[PDB]
Design a protein around this ligand. Structure first.
Ligand SMILES: [Mg+2]
Ligand SMILES: [Mg+2]
Ligand SMILES: [Mg+2]
Ligand SMILES: [Mg+2]
Ligand SMILES: [Zn+2]
Ligand SMILES: [Zn+2]
Ligand SMILES: [Zn+2]
Lengths: 90, 136, 33, 52, 225, 90, 84, 100
RNA sequence: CAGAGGUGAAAUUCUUAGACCGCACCAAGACGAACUACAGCGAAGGCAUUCUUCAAGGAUACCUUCCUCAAUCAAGAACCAAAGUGUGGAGAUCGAAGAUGAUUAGAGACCAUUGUAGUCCACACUGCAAACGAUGACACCCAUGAAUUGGGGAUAUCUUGCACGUUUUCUGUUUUCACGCGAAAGCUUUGAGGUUACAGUCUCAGGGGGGAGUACG
């Protein structure tokens, strides 16, 4: 429950992007603090995102929930595969 | 003279199973594994009427027949196992349980250890009769 | 031994009689209609 | 011989190398009952309810 | 004639027991293809522990030991431990009306490949100055006692052979250790091993059986009159 | 408005074939034509093509099984059993 | 005996054996303590019935184990009840 | 007319809904476990006279080793308990006396 | 190896083609003895082997938060022993219907040996019980001594943190004609008390016995 508790704090005071393309953009720009990935995700896409995170030395977290569960826990009404935090105020 | 090779005063042990219900009584002598049978005499083999099969007298008569044939076998001392019907039925022994044991001792046989072996269920299937029971 | 004086006949059997009567009436009305 | 007892299987060959002859119709299966290592034989319960 | 065909044999216990030849049995003589040895193997013999150990401690008189025949050697039957049980009269006299009865089942594997199942029974007791009418135990303590017993038995019995494990079950060696270590959790009136049974055995090994039996006494059943 | 009181899809049969056979077939007909949940995607996207064949509307997945529903109750028990037995093996 | 009881002015013996909400005027049961530290020797104010985690600043920070009633104090600290 | 305060059983108002039934020892009638009459019985296997003859013939059973006994828990229906003299009817004023 | 079963006594029934009995096993389906009680849990119906696991529920403790958000009910909704119904499984035990022996003037019954539906599981219906404490829900006052289940506060015994001893406390759950009430039986901090000295709040039902819970809708 700790990650669900922290994500709401980020949504209150922070900045983020949703989606693989925007997450990779923030990783290339080196303006990202944490990446979160859902448990159902194609292995190729998961492998690419983790490769970028390793190469950039960025903390990465496995959500253990569905992409629908991650989308709900984000306060949104749509499914999300990847979340990228670019500013955390808490 | 089919006994084993032992001294004249040695004790050779067997096991007797005494099954005494309220309709009959069994006197059954085996070895310590229960696989070989020496003699088996019942109370219905000594009386002529059905109502007398469970009498203490019928049980005593059956026991004396067992002792006579055991001398041929070569058996001298008998361990005793006793039981009632058990299961989901009654757990109390029949009238001939005590008479059979006493007759064996008084006939010259040595008595070893005694144990009750009535079947006892940890949990059980429903018994006969209705929920109202037997109505007399 | 556990009950007072009923009148008529055991009430459960009386109810069973009435039940059979109603079934027969239902069948007769069904045949006519 | 490598499948643990109690497992549910399909497409079973009665003789080795026949490429599958038992439990093939839709929704059907066999149950593995026991192994015997001395004789190298496995016991199965078939869809019909027979043992083989 | 029934007794024309019968030959006498002797049943021998393993070397853990002071009385080796403890029972006598009969069998058919070999006729044609019916060999007497193959029907003799596999039989189970029951005996009282007090008789085998030739003691009068009043605690061994309520235990029975069973042995299974594994090989025939002339007119001697070589056996191995099968199971041990407390007699029914003793077990039924330990139950009390206003206390808690706790039971545990433990499965352990020895070093020789033998698998055993153990059944343990324990009873609560009231303290010296207690005035309460009952002595029921709380469920949390009962579960804790069950967990400790399972840990202790699985640790001691997984490092010994089938012969040493039998030696521990007899002489009440394992029982005293359990009572001493379980009293701090709960005041125990009595703790007993009600039954121990072998549920799996390894493959037959002729040399292993001979080592367990040590020096085998001779039989005189075939000797000339 | 409702257009029917309890006949549903079976309204195409008029007064033919009997009430109990119609009621028994309706339950399987509804399931056969429903949209089922795709665990790879996270959306309700599986449709039956022919008996036993289920195709996802967005992703290119085809799955086998069920004949009138995506998964039969016996198959879930088999899945849990297989997973536990493999967990013992490994 | 031989002495009556005034409901308005009860005795100390009777008033002490009462639930906190059954007294003439209800009031708290808890208090505050000044607590030292193991091998650190700092000062912290701790509630007598604390249920959250109370930690020493700049130290091992393990004290005040919570229970179903009063909290337990680790043996490495000295405690003193504060007034009022 | 209510005859007994406890209604002949051991189930007060706000305690329990249902108690599992058991079979009577003699007739087999099903009755709730809290209503059946229960006794514990510890009877000698043999009578006093016959015990002496068996003890004389026994190398095991002497004076410092007693013979085994039978332990049974018995529960009866109301009718079977009365006929078998286990429990008898008492005057109105004496129905309250309870032993242990 | 010569009978076993069953009964008040017997007979239907099984048995030298080996029954009954004895020992160790294998299969399948139910059930969880003794410990088990005027004990615990649940809204009621109900709930008893062990281990792992998921979401709940109550009480207790608090110098935490909030600030009237509550009580009780037509309409409307959910759950509800057993028997019974539909579709798939299962089928050990017991056993409505039925069959065969006995009792009897008769015996279709009670007794004996059997046996189909059922009894067990999944999903879908049914909505009835002496579904009883024959006692609607919420709130106040009330005599004494016990006992007992869970939590908390204060200060002798035993094992090596647990249990126990004494005294208080909150919640539950019971037992010894309290005042008083009632036609009585009886109830009594837990009311059936605090009512002609008749008013705390809401709600369901009854009005001599049948016809009848029947007829019609
Ligand atoms: Mg009820
Ligand atoms: Mg039912
Ligand atoms: Mg009759
Ligand atoms: Mg039958
Ligand atoms: Zn898809
Ligand atoms: Zn510090
Ligand atoms: Zn009875």
């Amino acid at each position: 429950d700790t990650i669900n508790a922290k994500l709401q704090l980020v949504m209150k005071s922070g900045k983020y992007v949703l989606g693989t393309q925007q997450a990779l953009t923030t990783l290339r720009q080196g303006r990202s603090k944490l990446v979160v990935i859902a448990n159902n995700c194609p292995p190729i896409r998961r492998a690419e995102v983790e490769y970028y995170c390793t190469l950039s030395k960025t903390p990465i977290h496995h959500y253990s929930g569905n992409n629908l569960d991650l989308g709900t826990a984000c306060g949104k009404h749509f499914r999300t595969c990847v979340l990228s935090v670019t500013n955390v105020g808490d | 003279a089919y006994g084993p090779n032992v001294k004249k005063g040695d004790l050779v042990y067997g096991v007797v199973h005494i099954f005494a219900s309220f309709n009959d009584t069994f006197v059954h002598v085996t070895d310590m594994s229960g696989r070989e049978t020496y003699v088996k005499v019942t109370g219905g083999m000594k009386v002529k009427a059905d109502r007398d099969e469970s009498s203490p007298y019928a049980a005593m008569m059956a026991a004396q027949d067992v002792v006579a044939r055991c001398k041929e076998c070569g058996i001298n001392a008998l361990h005793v196992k006793m039981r009632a019907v058990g299961g989901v039925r009654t757990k109390s022994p029949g009238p001939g349980a005590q008479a059979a044991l006493r007759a064996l001792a008084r006939a010259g046989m040595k008595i070893g250890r005694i144990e009750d072996v009535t079947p006892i269920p940890t949990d059980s299937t429903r018994r006969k009769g209705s929920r109202r029971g037997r109505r007399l | 031994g556990t009950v007072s004086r009923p009148r008529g006949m055991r009430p459960k059997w009386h109810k069973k009689r009435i039940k059979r009567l109603k079934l027969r009436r239902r069948r007769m009305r069904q045949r006519s209609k | 011989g490598q499948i643990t007892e109690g497992c549910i299987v399909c497409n079973v060959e009665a003789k080795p190398g026949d490429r599958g002859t038992l439990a093939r119709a839709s929704g059907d299966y066999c149950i593995i009952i026991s192994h015997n290592h001395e004789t190298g034989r496995t016991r199965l319960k078939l869809p019909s309810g027979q043992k083989k | 004639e029934t007794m024309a065909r019968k030959e006498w044999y002797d049943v021998v216990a393993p070397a853990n027991f002071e009385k080796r030849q403890f029972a006598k049995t009969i069998c058919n003589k070999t006729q044609g293809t019916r060999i007497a040895a193959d029907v003799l193997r596999g039989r189970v013999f029951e005996a009282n522990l007090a008789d085998l150990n030739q003691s009068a401690g009043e605690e061994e008189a309520y235990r029975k030991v069973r042995f299974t025949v594994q090989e025939v050697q002339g007119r001697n039957l070589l056996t191995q431990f099968h199971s041990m049980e407390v007699t029914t009269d003793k077990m039924a006299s330990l139950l009390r009306k206003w206390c808690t009865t706790m039971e545990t089942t433990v499965e352990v594997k020895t070093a020789d490949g033998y698998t055993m199942r153990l059944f343990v029974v324990a009873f609560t007791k009231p303290q010296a100055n207690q005035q309460s009418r009952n002595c029921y135990a709380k469920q949390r303590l009962v579960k804790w006692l069950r967990m400790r017993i399972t840990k202790m038995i699985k640790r001691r019995l997984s490092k010994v052979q089938i012969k040493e494990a039998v030696s521990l079950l007899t002489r009440n060696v394992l029982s005293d250790a359990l009572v001493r270590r379980c009293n701090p959790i709960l005041p125990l009136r009595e703790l007993r091993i009600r039954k121990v049974r072998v549920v799996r055995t390894p493959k037959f090994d002729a040399q292993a059986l001979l080592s367990a039996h040590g020096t085998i006494p001779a039989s005189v059943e075939a000797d000339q009159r | 408005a409702k257009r029917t009181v309890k006949m549903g899809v079976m309204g195409r049969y008029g007064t033919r074939y009997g009430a109990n056979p119609r009621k028994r077939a309706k339950k399987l007909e509804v399931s056969q034509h429903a949209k089922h949940f795709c665990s790879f995607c996270g959306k309700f996207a599986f449709r039956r093509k022919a008996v036993g064949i289920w195709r996802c509307d967005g992703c290119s997945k085809t799955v086998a099984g069920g004949a009138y529903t995506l998964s039969t109750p016996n198959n879930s028990t088999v899945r849990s059993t297989v997973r536990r037995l493999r967990e013992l093996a490994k | 005996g031989f002495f009556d009881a005034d409901l308005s002015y009860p005795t100390v013996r009777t008033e002490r054996m009462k639930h906190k909400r059954r007294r003439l005027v209800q009031g708290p049961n808890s208090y505050f303590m000044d607590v030292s530290c193991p091998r650190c020797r700092q000062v912290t104010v701790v509630y007598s019935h604390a249920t959250t985690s109370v930690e020493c600043k700049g130290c091992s920070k393990k004290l005040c184990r919570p229970t179903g009633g009063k909290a337990l104090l680790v043996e490495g600290c000295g405690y003193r009840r504060k007034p009022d | 007319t209510t005859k007994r305060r406890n209604h002949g059983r051991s189930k007060p108002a706000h305690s329990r809904g249902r108690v599992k039934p058991i079979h009577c020892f003699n007739c087999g009638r099903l009755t709730p476990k809290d209503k059946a009459v229960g006794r514990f019985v510890v009877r000698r296997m043999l009578d006093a006279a016959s015990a002496r003859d068996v003890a004389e013939a026994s190398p095991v059973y002497g004076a410092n080793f007693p013979m085994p006994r039978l332990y049974m828990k018995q529960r009866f229906c109301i009718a079977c308990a009365i006929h078998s003299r286990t429990v008898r009817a008492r005057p109105v004023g004496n129905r309250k006396i309870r032993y242990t």
